[PDB]
Amino acid sequence: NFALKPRMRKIFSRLIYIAQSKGAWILTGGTHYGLMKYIGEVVRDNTISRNSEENIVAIGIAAWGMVSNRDTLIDEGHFSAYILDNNHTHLLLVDNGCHGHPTVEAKLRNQLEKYISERTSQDSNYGGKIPIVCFAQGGGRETLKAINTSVKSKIPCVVVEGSGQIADVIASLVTSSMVKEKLVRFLPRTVSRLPEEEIESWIKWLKEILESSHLLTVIKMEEAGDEIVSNAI
Amino acid sequence: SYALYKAFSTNEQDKDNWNGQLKLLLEWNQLDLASDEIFTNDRRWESADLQEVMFTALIKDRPKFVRLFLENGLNLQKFLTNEVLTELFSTHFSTLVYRNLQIAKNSYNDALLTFVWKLVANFRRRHPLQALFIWAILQNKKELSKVIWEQTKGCTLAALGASKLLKTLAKVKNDINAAGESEELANEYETRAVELFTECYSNDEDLAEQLLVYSCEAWGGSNCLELAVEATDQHFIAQPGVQNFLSKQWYGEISRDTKNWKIILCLFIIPLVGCGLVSFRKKLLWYYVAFFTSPFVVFSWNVVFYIAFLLLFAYVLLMDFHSVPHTPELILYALVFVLFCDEVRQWYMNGVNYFTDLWNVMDTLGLFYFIAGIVFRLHSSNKSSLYSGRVIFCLDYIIFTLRLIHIFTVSRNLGPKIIMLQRMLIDVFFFLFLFAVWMVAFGVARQGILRQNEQRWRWIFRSVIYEPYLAMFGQVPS
Amino acid sequence: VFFFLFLFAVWMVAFGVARQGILRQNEQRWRWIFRSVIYEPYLAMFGQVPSDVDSTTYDFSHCTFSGNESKPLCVELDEHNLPRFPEWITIPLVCIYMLSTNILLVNLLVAMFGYTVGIVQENNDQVWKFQRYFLVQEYCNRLNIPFPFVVFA
Amino acid sequence: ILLVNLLVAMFGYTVGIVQENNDQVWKFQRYFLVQEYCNRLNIPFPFVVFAYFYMVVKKCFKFRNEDNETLAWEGVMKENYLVKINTK
Amino acid sequence: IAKNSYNDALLTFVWKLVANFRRRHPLQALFIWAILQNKKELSKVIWEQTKGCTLAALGASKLLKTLAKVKNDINAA
Numbered sequence A: 001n002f003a004l005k006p007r008m009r010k011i012f013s014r015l016i017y018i019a020q021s022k023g024a025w026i027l028t029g030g031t032h033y034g035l036m037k038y039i040g041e042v043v044r045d046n047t048i049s050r051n052s053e054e055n056i057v058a059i060g061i062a063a064w065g066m067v068s069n070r071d072t073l074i075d076e077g078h079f080s081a082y083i084l085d086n087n088h089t090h091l092l093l094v095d096n097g098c099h100g101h102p103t104v105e106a107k108l109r110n111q112l113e114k115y116i117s118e119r120t121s122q123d124s125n126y127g128g129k130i131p132i133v134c135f136a137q138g139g140g141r142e143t144l145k146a147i148n149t150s151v152k153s154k155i156p157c158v159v160v161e162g163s164g165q166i167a168d169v170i171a172s173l174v175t176s177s178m179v180k181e182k183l184v185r186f187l188p189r190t191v192s193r194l195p196e197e198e199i200e201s202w203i204k205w206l207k208e209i210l211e212s213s214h215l216l217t218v219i220k221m222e223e224a225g226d227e228i229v230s231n232a233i
Numbered sequence B: 001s002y003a004l005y006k007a008f009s010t011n012e013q014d015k016d017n018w019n020g021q022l023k024l025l026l027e028w029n030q031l032d033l034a035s036d037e038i039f040t041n042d043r044r045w046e047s048a049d050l051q052e053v054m055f056t057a058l059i060k061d062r063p064k065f066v067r068l069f070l071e072n073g074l075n076l077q078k079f080l081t082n083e084v085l086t087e088l089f090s091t092h093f094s095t096l097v098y099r100n101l102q103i104a105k106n107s108y109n110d111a112l113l114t115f116v117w118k119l120v121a122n123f124r125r126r127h128p129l130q131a132l133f134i135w136a137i138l139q140n141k142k143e144l145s146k147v148i149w150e151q152t153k154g155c156t157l158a159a160l161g162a163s164k165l166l167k168t169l170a171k172v173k174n175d176i177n178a179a180g181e182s183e184e185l186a187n188e189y190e191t192r193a194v195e196l197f198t199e200c201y202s203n204d205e206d207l208a209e210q211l212l213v214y215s216c217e218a219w220g221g222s223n224c225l226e227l228a229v230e231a232t233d234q235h236f237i238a239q240p241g242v243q244n245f246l247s248k249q250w251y252g253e254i255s256r257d258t259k260n261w262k263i264i265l266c267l268f269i270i271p272l273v274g275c276g277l278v279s280f281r282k283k284l285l286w287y288y289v290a291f292f293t294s295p296f297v298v299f300s301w302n303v304v305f306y307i308a309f310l311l312l313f314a315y316v317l318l319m320d321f322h323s324v325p326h327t328p329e330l331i332l333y334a335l336v337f338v339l340f341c342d343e344v345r346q347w348y349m350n351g352v353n354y355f356t357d358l359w360n361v362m363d364t365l366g367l368f369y370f371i372a373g374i375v376f377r378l379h380s381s382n383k384s385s386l387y388s389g390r391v392i393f394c395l396d397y398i399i400f401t402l403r404l405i406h407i408f409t410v411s412r413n414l415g416p417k418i419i420m421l422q423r424m425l426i427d428v429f430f431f432l433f434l435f436a437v438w439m440v441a442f443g444v445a446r447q448g449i450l451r452q453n454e455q456r457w458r459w460i461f462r463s464v465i466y467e468p469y470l471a472m473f474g475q476v477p478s
Numbered sequence C: 001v002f003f004f005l006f007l008f009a010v011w012m013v014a015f016g017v018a019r020q021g022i023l024r025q026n027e028q029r030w031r032w033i034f035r036s037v038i039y040e041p042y043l044a045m046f047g048q049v050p051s052d053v054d055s056t057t058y059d060f061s062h063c064t065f066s067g068n069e070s071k072p073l074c075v076e077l078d079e080h081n082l083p084r085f086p087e088w089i090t091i092p093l094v095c096i097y098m099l100s101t102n103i104l105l106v107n108l109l110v111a112m113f114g115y116t117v118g119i120v121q122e123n124n125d126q127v128w129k130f131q132r133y134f135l136v137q138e139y140c141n142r143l144n145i146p147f148p149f150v151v152f153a
Numbered sequence D: 001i002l003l004v005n006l007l008v009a010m011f012g013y014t015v016g017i018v019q020e021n022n023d024q025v026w027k028f029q030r031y032f033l034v035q036e037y038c039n040r041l042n043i044p045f046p047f048v049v050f051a052y053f054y055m056v057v058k059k060c061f062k063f064r065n066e067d068n069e070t071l072a073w074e075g076v077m078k079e080n081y082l083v084k085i086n087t088k
Numbered sequence E: 001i002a003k004n005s006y007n008d009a010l011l012t013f014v015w016k017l018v019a020n021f022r023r024r025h026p027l028q029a030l031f032i033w034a035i036l037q038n039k040k041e042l043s044k045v046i047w048e049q050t051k052g053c054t055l056a057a058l059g060a061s062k063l064l065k066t067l068a069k070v071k072n073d074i075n076a077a
């Protein structure tokens, strides 16, 4: 699910407006579920309003192990009603063995992020180097794993909000004790299916998050006017 | 409500009962509480289970909860089936509103009302969101209407059709409070339509002109511009975007930024289309056809022809009129036959509303008096029939000449003043009533004091009415 | 003014040709076409009330019977040497015309003048002292002496 | 004098009413003449009767994607307009 | 379209200079550049730097009142 309050709606419409303004790629999960549905909707909206001047590029990266209807051709396919979203203009699905395998796309995804972060292209104002921003707004294991995979790598540029599940627990604090304190008060019904043998691991995850706080930034509640996304990025 | 929610939630058994808490916070107006601690954790949204609570939020005037349910995921057209709509128009449709609808259908009947009477007579016994918008808009709900208006596809057509329905139902005379609310809601939606279309035109011109002409696959079976006209929404057409559309459709292929004297001078000098004095932006025979296709020059050619027709009519009627028709009389009959074919074509393309306009009525009247003048005129060897035929042609010339006013309403300067002229008829008839009263009073007083027992009706009415009538132009009776 | 002249020309031509067609028969002189179609309905704007429509105040001493001398033609006669034109169709026609031009169409012009004065007055001080520039510049540019003597310079 | 100069005053007041509406009423009436001169496949008028015989020649013998596209266009400025209302 | 249909002295002057530079009072030339494009906020920033301030404001007012008469693209008008 995705709790679509109009604030995050405005933020992501502004975001895809910035992506059309600068001619950027966006990378996302690419399934037809939750946020990527709405992101594909806004991609279709800005595509259908102007239809030119650097039409935007969304790449969805999926795992191929959760996909319901899978077809093999060389000759176009027809996917119909995890489910892929219909509005992402490019899709990539990683190869593995069986179906019961989440988090398989993450290694190739982060390796691709690292390669563009070390890709040299001097035709910009960033000293070449093609600047990369990561966004966290929701919650889950894959969020924290991707943020630590980013911040361990060079140039993560992680941006968070002050609303959600893990966005609240990173946005509030800026040792093990305070991590536990905010983690139990902001996520009541997710710890109830969790052992502490990985909760100490999550403490290690967030200690590797907060190791470099200059590579992290936050969108606040008082910062809620116009062009706050540009002020963040 | 908060106390009952706290006692209902902490009973250690129904902590998982989200439906009961939702129905409880729906029966009261706790929007913020249901936003904060029902729809927060993203833990259980089935998105097809929200149907009964949607039906309840509709039938009990809960606009913020239906806004919240559509915000948190519920497709209307999936929800809004025929059983739902028959239950709304059957059970939850008020019975005073239906009486106002009968009175409006019997006394202020119209095309859009016949359409909505057909569909409301359907569902008491496919574009569904517009049907539920009609449901909410008739009941004067005023806040469920906007929530469902924002979900609609044909937005400006919805706003114009709702404005027209409410401007009709504001005329039903009993229950003037409902008339007042429907009048306010009509003004609100016509403002909304104007303000949305000026944004759509300001961001792009070509696609807004795409919007003006579309039919919504039978919204009410009509068009955005047609619904603006039929409600007399003369602020929607007075805005610069629709005026730009009208003038671009009026000049045709000729670009609007060429001066009018160049156009009419190239009209008189016919082969001068092959020069750079007109601009055809908006090989050489294409210039020829693209000049002679546009509405501006076929109208101007048509008024030149009509002036020459009136000069021929005047020549034939005054200076060349004998027992047998000469050649110019027969040419005159031919031109009136051309005008007759034009009017029967316009009746064939219009039908009943052809007789709506006054100008087509007097147009039919003038054609009938012309053929009456023909059938009186052909009885040769009879002086009375020939002279009566000429009298009929003279009165018909009065009619044909007065039509020229309505011809020349198209100017930027003659136009508004000819429109202003026809708003004066109530002052003219007030003046004629009072002048008739004073005239009859003085006429009978003078004719009774002076004379004694006139028996001739002509010399009654020449001395009672006619001389006090001439005493209005300063004659001072003798 | 030109709006008034357009509408008055339309009404004037309509009534003029109607009266000249009902009364007379086949005038051939263009001067006595345009004196009786345009000129007398024009004078009916200053309150003249056109004359030869009454059939009782109409004497035959102002006719010609044929186009021979100055005066207009007679109305075309009956076989009993009587005027053929109905009073019941020429009397109310003169009444309708005289009402519609001498009262309605003039007092429309009065109203349009009143409204135009009501528009342009709060601008009219600005328009006057804008036009003042042009006369000040044409009288200050030239090295001007008195006018009769200007030819010497 | 009295009854005529009453009519002068009533005309003056009616012109004073309907003038700020009169530009709107003129360019509302403009619709009707533009629609009667753009609807017909019109040639010059004297010759129009010939094409009426061609009408007799007729009597001698006798969901779409871009509309959804422009409605989807309209929805964007609907959202923009609603944002502007709530920004007021 | 404005030079062919609403011709004037100041427009012939700016048409001469804009036909010059597509093939000395420079700030007024850049003010004409920004003022023609309807930039509306670069114009004021460069207006404040100008010497002949009121002449700049009157000449810009005259150019824009001319270009508001061009009939196509009424939004730019």
Ligand SMILES: O=C1NC(c2cccc([N+](=O)[O-])c2)=CCN1c1ccccc1O
Residues within 6 Å of the ligand: B299, B302, B303, B306, B339, B340, B342, B343, B362, B363, B364, B365, B366, B367, B399, B400, B403, B406, B407
């Ligand atoms: O088409 C036309 N038909 C008649 C007409 C035709 C037959 C009889 C009568 N009539 O007697 O009033 C009028 C009126 C004038 N007219 C016209 C010509 C040029 C421009 C605009 C126009 O409306």
Ligand SMILES: [Ca+2]
Residues within 6 Å of the ligand: B343, B346, B359, B360, B363
């Ligand atoms: Ca007609």
